[PDB]
Amino acid sequence: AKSKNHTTHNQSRKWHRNGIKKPKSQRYESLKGVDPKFMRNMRFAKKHNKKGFKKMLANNAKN
């Protein structure tokens, strides 16, 4: 009472039945798996980014 072992015959039709969908490209992709030492300093760059907010307003006025 043997049967069939492996088949990929009708699988291409099933895959394209709803179409092969790529993940929607999102701005600001996820930062998972990045260097932890790099992520530490990048958090500190955003943590103290408001410290130079007064210099930003002064330099924008020169333009």
Partner 1 sequence: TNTRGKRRGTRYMFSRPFRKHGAVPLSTYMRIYKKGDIVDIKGMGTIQKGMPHKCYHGKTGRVYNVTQHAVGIIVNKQLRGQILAKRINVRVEHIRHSKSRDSFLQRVKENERKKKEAKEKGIWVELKRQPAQPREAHFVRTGGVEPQLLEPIPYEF
Partner RNA sequence: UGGGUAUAGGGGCGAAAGACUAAUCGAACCAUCUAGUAGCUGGUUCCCUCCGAAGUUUCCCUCAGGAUAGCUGGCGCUCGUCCGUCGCAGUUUUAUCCGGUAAAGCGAAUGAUUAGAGGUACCUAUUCUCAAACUUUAAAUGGGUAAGAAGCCCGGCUCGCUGGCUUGGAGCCGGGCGUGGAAUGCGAGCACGCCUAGUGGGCCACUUUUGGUAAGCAGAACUGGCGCUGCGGGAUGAACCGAACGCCGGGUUAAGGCGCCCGAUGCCGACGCUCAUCAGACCCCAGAAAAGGUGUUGGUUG
Partner RNA sequence: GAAGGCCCGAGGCGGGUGUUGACGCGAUGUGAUUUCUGCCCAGUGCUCUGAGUCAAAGUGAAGAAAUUCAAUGAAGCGCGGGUAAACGGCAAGGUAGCCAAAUGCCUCGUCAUCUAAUUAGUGACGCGCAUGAAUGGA
Partner RNA sequence: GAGUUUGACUGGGGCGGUACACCUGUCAAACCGUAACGCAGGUGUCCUAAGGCGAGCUCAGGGAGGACAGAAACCUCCCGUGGAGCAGAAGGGCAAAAGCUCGCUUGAUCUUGAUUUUCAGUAUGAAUACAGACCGUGAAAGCGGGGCCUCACGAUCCUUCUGACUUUUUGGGUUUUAAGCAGGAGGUGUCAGAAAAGUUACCACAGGGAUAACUGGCUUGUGGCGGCCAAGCGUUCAUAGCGACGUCGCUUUUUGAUCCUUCGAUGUCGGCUCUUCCUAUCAUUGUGAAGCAGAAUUCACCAAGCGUUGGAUUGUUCACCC
Partner RNA sequence: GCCUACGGCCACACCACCCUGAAAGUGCCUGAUCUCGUCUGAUCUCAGAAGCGAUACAGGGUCGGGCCUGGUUAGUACCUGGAUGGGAGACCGCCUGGGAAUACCAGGUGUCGUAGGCU
Which positions lie near partner 1, rule CB under 8 A? 6, 11, 14-16, 18-23, 29, 31-35
In whole angstroms, what is the distance from residue 50 CA to residue 35 CA? 24
- Among positions 7, 8, 10, 11, the unique one binding Mg ion when judged by CB under 5 A: 10
In whole angstroms, what is the distance from residue 2 CA to residue 30 CA? 49
In whole angstroms, what is the distance from residue 30 CA to residue 54 CA? 30
Site residues (vs Mg ion, CB under 5 A): 3, 10
Site residues (vs RNA, CB under 7 A): 1-28, 32-33, 35-38, 40-42, 44-49, 51-53, 55-56, 59-60, 62-63
